[PDB]
């Protein structure tokens, strides 16, 4: 409903997130940036965004490799640490779990990579509000479940890696970052439905349920398509099968994902999606990005709710990859393949 | 199940017999002299 909630904490974070969300790359800037092939036309459209402040300070016409990583790291750190540092209450505490869930995937791969005997001297942050030297090196250096639970217990609130460490303590899911990443993606998908069901009374959310259901179905279809041709075990949980809409069964997703190759769950889930009968990874990769990009601009119309900040925090992952692919492709003198096929932003 | 798999993968070109042993089971099949490899 509307007119019954007076949360000033969501109104302050909605205005602080709306101030950075106002001067951002919209769908017209991405459509004009994808069709553009000039340095002045590409730098002029991307220069008016939040990531274009570094291009305004340091003027350039050709996008470099280190400049896109430094501008994307400063844009993500300024868009995440600035909004997270200025928020308080249940809005900041609930907003910290979204960054902790995104940083838990890199923290689990760094923790498994530390026991895997791999080199590590630089780690990029996508949506993690904490740096890779304060919280990531302590959890990555520790290899025991008692030290990971003790280090996870010091943080407030608890991160999602405690349940993955508790499930992985008995050796019930996998001994790699693949099955722990799929089970962590399924538990992260269930945590959004639990938080959306818990916050359904005070805040009114309608676009967050459709964006969470479409992002959960596209994340389950992308997780099932990612385990295809990769030697996925049928007994272990690796396809991310779970009920989130009502038209996706676990036997159809895991059976069609593992060794069956049955795209009936895509057409049975919906007919307005980009891929419902396709079987190629190239068209399914652009169709999953076009389906995940939808429900983002329409969710930004409503204000005074965390559903707009939930899709706005998830839009920076596709916007950073689209801006990095468009800036690297246009700066590298080449044509975009995944960015040219996508039209929904 | 071996007779069902042999009948499903080779048709009716075999013999289905069973003999009680001391546990074990005595089986015997009959076919051509040139189909010993198959």
């Amino acid at each position: 409903m509307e007119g019954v909630y007076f949360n000033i904490d969501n109104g302050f974070i909605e205005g602080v997130v709306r101030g950075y969300r106002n001067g951002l790359l919209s769908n017209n800037q991405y459509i004009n940036l994808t069709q553009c092939d000039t340095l002045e036309d590409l730098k002029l459209q991307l220069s008016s965004t939040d990531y274009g402040n570094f291009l305004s300070s340091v003027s350039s016409e050709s996008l470099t490799t280190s400049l896109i990583q430094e501008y994307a790291s400063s844009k993500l750190y300024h868009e995440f640490n600035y909004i997270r540092d200025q928020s308080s209450g249940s809005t900041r505490k609930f907003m910290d779990y979204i960054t902790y869930g995104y940083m838990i995937d890199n923290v689990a791969l760094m923790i498994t990579g530390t026991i895997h005997d791999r080199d590590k001297g630089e780690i990029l942050q996508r949506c993690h509000p904490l740096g890779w030297f304060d919280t990531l090196p302590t959890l990555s250096v520790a290899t025991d479940l008692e030290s990971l639970y003790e280090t996870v217990l010091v943080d407030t609130p608890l991160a999602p890696y405690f349940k993955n460490c508790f499930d992985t303590a008995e050796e019930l899911d996998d001994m790699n970052i693949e099955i722990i990443r799929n089970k962590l993606y399924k538990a992260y998908l269930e945590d959004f439905y639990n938080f959306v069901t818990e916050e359904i009374p005070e805040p009114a959310k309608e676009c967050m349920q459709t964006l969470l259901g479409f992002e959960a179905d596209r994340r389950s279809i992308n997780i099932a398509l990612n385990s295809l041709q990769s030697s996925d075990i049928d007994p272990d949980l690796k396809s991310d099968l779970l009920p989130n809409i009502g038209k996706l069964y676990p036997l159809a997703t895991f059976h069609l994902a593992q060794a069956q190759d049955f795209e009936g769950v895509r057409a049975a889930l919906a007919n307005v999606y980009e891929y419902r009968g396709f079987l190629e990874t190239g068209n399914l990769e652009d169709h999953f990005y076009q389906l995940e990009m939808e429900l983002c601009r329409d969710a930004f119309t409503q204000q005074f709710a965390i559903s707009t900040v939930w899709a706005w925090m998830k839009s920076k992952e596709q916007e950073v990859r689209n801006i990095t692919w468009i800036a690297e492709c246009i700066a590298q003198n080449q044509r975009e393949r995944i960015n040219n096929y996508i039209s929904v932003y | 199940l071996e007779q069902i798999l042999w009948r499903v993968l080779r048709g009716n070109l075999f013999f289905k017999t069973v003999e009680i042993e001391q546990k074990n089971a005595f089986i015997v099949f009959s076919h051509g002299d040139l189909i010993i490899k198959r």
């Binding site: 004009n32 036309d41 069956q260 | 009948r7 009716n12 051509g32």
Partner: protein, 392 residues
């Protein structure tokens, strides 16, 4: 069932010996038991027998049966791929090309008159070379329609790439269809042509700030020479040295600068690329339609001959003695193959054995595993006699 069956009739291919009889009618022929004892009295029986081929031994018959089953499954998938490729072009509906006369004759009349007649096949050669030649001809016929569909998709992608240069948003498009000798002068090094894309709200700001946007400009050039759906196109003439200051003031004014140069070869190649892509896609669709129709007809005839040879090899390998048997095709109506399959399987199930007979009806296929095919090399359903399910 089938991926291309919408309103087509179903047929069941059965094979039995010439001295067999049913279990529900002792002392009666199989033709009278199929015609009179059929479910509902509307069962249509047609001849499906063919001439016998030279057999060397059972070892070559087993490998010919496995290669005939794999070539029958590959021809069945190749027929559905050409049927889906022909249905995707919008040249055949869900009630045409599945229930109409194919090969200039009906499905029951052409199937009843199919006595192993070919124009490139013989009756004294090996069946393995004819089945492999038919499977290679159907695979090449489906590969030709797939290559024609890929070339039509590439021509449609080239036409879609030329459509962005032909019109749309002024970000990659260049004016090559509205250029004249009175709006763009590039005959000397003093004057040049620079395009500036401005919005509808910023038209007065670009028209008023056009004189102060750069030094050495040409007045009276504020006109709508081109129009878009997100911005307006304006023409401005100035020196080449002032393009950096005009582009800097245009970028500071929140405008969209366009890099365009006066050249007839760019507009001629830009129009010739879209015309060649449109003519190439238009010829590729017309060639792909007839190639898909001829590949569908040749894949249908090769699928029918491969199905008859696979049914004869499966009946000869599964039956043993005698070498000759009664092979016919029974035409069933739509949504009636379960009763004829359960009655024919229950009636003819006692011929093979009482331990390998089970109740089954219809044909249920799956994406993970195609069932009800009677495969002799992979795990699938099996019956006492030769039984094949064909869904048109």
């Amino acid at each position: 069932m089938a991926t291309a069956l919408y309103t087509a009739n179903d047929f069941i291919l059965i094979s039995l010996p010439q001295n067999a009889q049913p279990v529900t009618a002792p002392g009666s022929k199989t033709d009278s038991w199929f015609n009179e004892t059929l479910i509902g009295g509307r069962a249509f029986v047609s001849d499906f027998k063919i001439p016998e081929f030279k057999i060397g031994s059972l070892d070559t018959l087993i490998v010919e049966s496995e290669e005939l089953s794999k070539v029958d499954n590959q021809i069945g998938a190749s027929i559905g791929k050409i049927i889906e490729i022909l249905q995707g072009l919008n040249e055949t509906s869900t009630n045409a090309y599945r229930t109409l006369p194919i090969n200039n004759m009906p499905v029951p009349e052409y199937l009843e008159n199919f006595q192993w007649q070919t124009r490139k096949f013989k009756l004294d050669k090996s069946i393995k070379d004819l089945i492999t030649l038919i499977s290679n001809e159907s695979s090449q016929l489906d590969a030709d329609v797939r290559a024609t569909y890929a070339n039509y998709n590439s021509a449609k992608t080239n036409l879609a790439a030329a459509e962005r240069k032909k019109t749309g948003d002024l970000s990659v498009r260049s004016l090559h269809d509205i250029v004249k000798p009175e709006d763009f002068v590039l005959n000397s090094e003093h004057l040049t042509t620079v395009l500036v894309a401005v919005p509808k709200s910023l038209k007065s700001d670009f028209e008023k700030s056009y004189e102060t946007l750069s030094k050495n400009v040409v007045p009276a050039s504020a006109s709508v020479i081109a129009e878009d759906a997100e911005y307006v196109l304006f023409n401005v003439h100035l020196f080449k040295k002032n393009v950096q200051e005009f582009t800097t003031a245009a970028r500071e004014k929140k405008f969209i600068p366009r890099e365009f140069n006066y050249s007839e070869e760019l507009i001629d190649q830009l129009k010739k690329e879209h015309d060649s892509a449109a003519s190439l896609e238009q010829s590729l669709r017309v060639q792909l339609v007839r190639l898909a129709k001829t590949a569908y007809v040749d894949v249908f005839i090769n699928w029918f001959h491969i199905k008859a040879l696979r049914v004869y090899v499966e009946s000869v390998l599964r039956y043993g003695l005698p070498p000759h048997f009664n092979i016919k095709i029974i035409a069933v109506p739509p949504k009636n193959l379960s009763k004829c399959k359960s009655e024919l399987i229950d009636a003819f199930g006692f011929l093979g054995g009482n331990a390998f007979m089970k109740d089954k009806k219809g044909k249920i296929n799956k994406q993970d595993t195609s069932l009800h095919q009677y495969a002799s090399l992979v795990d699938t359903e099996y019956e006492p006699f030769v039984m094949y399910i064909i869904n048109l």
